[PDB]
């Protein structure tokens, strides 16, 4: 189904309760006459940005909130402002996940985050703090078992401990991320990573444990605790382990802070049915009976609607997901998170192995995250000869980091010239540059050349620059250079005052 006025097409992933959502669409039809078509296309999160521009996307798209940042950056999602009472039905932190540069661009549906998963038979009383884990491991090691095994390779799993006392990826304030405020090398992250590394040095954990290793050990009854999300529950069910899910341990009295992913409902900017979409979502889906229909089909986990979450939370596994989510941090929806994952992944590996101190590892990662974040939305570094081969070929397309010198970017300006020898047809043209307004008598022959000027910034220089997640800093620089060129040139060309009409 393509978008058609007077009806709704919804895209949602195949692993969600689409049948249940279809029932909600049928109640919407029966009450209002508006047909609702629920589709679960393959690769729908990548199809959407490709076709939404050409107006062949859905009215509504369900996906993880952090993907919606790119959609919103391209203007593909309708901005919503639901009524005060409607917003108050949902947990405030979930609304933060669907803000993009201050604008609400979707509706929160469900919530997921990591929790502490524990073996009740081995560990009836799971620890409330990380600090008691060493001692717990001594007791369990004397039984031929261990306290804790989780994926140490991926910062998604290790960052909850690291952030507990103050680490963060990018500072969030009022629906906006500041990519100039990275929290990778502050005192909180160092304390948390130091505790993570000491667990490894004192042999309570092994530096090479990954997702597969931890999963097998816990489901086989060999470790008392793992850290994982709701997607892992099914495999534990199949195993013989009597397991609980609970709040993650504190560190220095501070909650562990896992990243929070919010399933969210976005409205296509090109939809002619915006009001029908808001009506469907606010009065039919985001209600006890709406979410129940979906949950009944395939479980949503913890949900953003307070009244129905209190129903689901009678399951303590779901209550723990919501609690860790409320104590965690919203996954930033900006693509510069790529810089965060790349830098931090290396820091944990090097600190864990003793290649670097915790202090120097996070120092390096703080700097690396800053630079890649300033340089662009994804990790790309170019070898210097390979870049100089671009420049000497006249190729000015690359902007970003180049190994050895830092960041490169281009500003553009057009030069005008007048032919000085137009009567000499049997000769090489000679030209002379002319100032900004450029106006010459009609018989003059005017030639223009386009000038791409290369800029080189060291990483340190780059960081003092006003880089931003939402707007490229180089844009204003180019307009600044073009303006001052103009202002100087026009006084050179003609000092008669311009006939400017000035308002008010």
């Amino acid at each position: 189904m393509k978008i058609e006025e007077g009806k709704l097409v919804i895209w949602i992933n195949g692993d969600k309760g689409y049948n249940g959502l279809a029932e909600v669409g049928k109640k919407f039809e029966k009450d209002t006459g508006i047909k609702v078509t629920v589709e679960h296309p393959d690769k729908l999160e990548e199809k959407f940005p490709q076709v939404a521009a050409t107006g062949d996307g859905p009215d509504i798209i369900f996906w993880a909130h952090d993907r919606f940042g790119g959609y919103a950056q391209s203007g593909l999602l309708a901005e919503i402002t639901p009524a005060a009472a409607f917003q108050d039905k949902l947990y405030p932190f979930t609304w933060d996940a669907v803000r993009y540069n201050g604008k609400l661009i979707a509706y929160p549906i469900a919530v997921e985050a990591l929790s502490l998963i524990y073996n009740k038979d081995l560990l009836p009383n799971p620890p409330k703090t990380w600090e008691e884990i060493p001692a717990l491991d001594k007791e369990l090691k004397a039984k031929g078992k261990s306290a804790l095994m989780f994926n140490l390779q991926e910062p998604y799993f290790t960052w909850p401990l690291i952030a507990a006392d103050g680490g963060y990826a990018f500072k969030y304030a009022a629906g906006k991320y500041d990519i100039k405020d990275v929290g990778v090398d502050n005192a909180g992250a160092k304390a948390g990573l130091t505790f993570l590394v000491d667990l490894i040095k004192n042999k309570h954990m092994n530096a090479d444990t990954d997702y597969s290793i931890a999963e097998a050990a816990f489901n086989k009854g060999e470790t008392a605790m793992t850290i994982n999300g709701p997607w892992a529950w099914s495999n534990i069910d199949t195993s013989a382990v009597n397991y609980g899910v609970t709040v993650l341990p504190t560190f220095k009295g501070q909650p562990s802070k896992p990243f929070v992913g919010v399933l969210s409902a976005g409205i296509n900017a090109a939809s002619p049915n915006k009001e029908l979409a808001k009506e469907f979502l606010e009065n039919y889906l985001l209600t006890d009976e709406g979410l129940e229909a979906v949950n009944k089909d395939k479980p949503l986990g913890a949900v953003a609607l307070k009244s129905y979450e209190e129903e689901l939370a009678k399951d303590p596994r779901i209550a723990a997901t919501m609690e860790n989510a409320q104590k965690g941090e919203i996954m930033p929806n900006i693509p510069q998170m790529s810089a965060f994952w790349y830098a931090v992944r290396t820091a944990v590996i090097n600190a864990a192995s003793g290649r670097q101190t915790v202090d120097e590892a996070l120092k390096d990662a703080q700097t690396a995250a800053r630079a890649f974040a300033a340089a662009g939305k994804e990790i790309e570094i170019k070898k210097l000869p390979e870049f100089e081969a671009m420049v000497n070929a006249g190729n000015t397309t690359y902007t970003g980091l180049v190994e050895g010198i830092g960041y490169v970017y281009w500003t553009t300006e057009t030069l005008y010239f007048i032919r000085t020898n137009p009567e000499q047809l049997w000769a090489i043209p000679k030209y002379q540059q002319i100032p900004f307004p450029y106006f010459q008598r009609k018989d003059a022959i005017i030639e223009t050349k386009t000038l791409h000027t290369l800029h080189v910034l060291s990483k340190d220089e780059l960081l003092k620059l006003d880089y931003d997640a939402y707007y490229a800093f180089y844009g204003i620089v180019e307009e600044m250079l073009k303006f001052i060129h103009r202002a100087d040139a026009i006084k050179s060309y003609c000092e008669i005052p311009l006939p400017i009409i000035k308002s008010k």
């Binding site: 010239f417 791409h452 220089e461 600044m480 001052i484």
Partner: protein
């Protein structure tokens, strides 16, 4: 000429001599498509380095912040003189904010 910054590439290859605005310097000729930092600066006439620009924005922002803080101070001053007696401590606070901005401005202007 710090080694690779301020070189320029010309998209349009062409024969013929392109002279500077004054007519004394040959910017490029005979199908040269790459200018040195020196020609770039002559053809463009004016320039600004990013680092100096940033100190300029800090100067301007801090000055803007000092003018705004001072407008609020006068509004509190109106209240105070008119008997409104609640604003006296927002007036003290508003004042040390006012000078912090001014000191930042002077620090920024000093860098230029």
């Amino acid at each position: 000429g710090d080694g690779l910054s301020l070189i320029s590439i010309i998209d349009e290859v062409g024969n013929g001599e392109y002279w500077s605005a004054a007519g004394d310097i040959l910017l490029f000729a005979a199908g040269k498509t790459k200018l040195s930092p020196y020609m770039t600066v002559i053809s463009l006439g004016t320039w600004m380095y990013e680092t100096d620009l940033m100190q300029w924005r800090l100067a301007c922002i801090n000055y803007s912040d000092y003018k705004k803080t001072l407008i609020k101070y006068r509004e509190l001053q109106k209240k105070f003189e008119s008997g409104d007696k609640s604003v006296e401590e927002k007036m003290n606070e508003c004042h040390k904010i006012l000078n912090s901005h001014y000191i930042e401005m002077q620090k920024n202007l000093g860098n230029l």
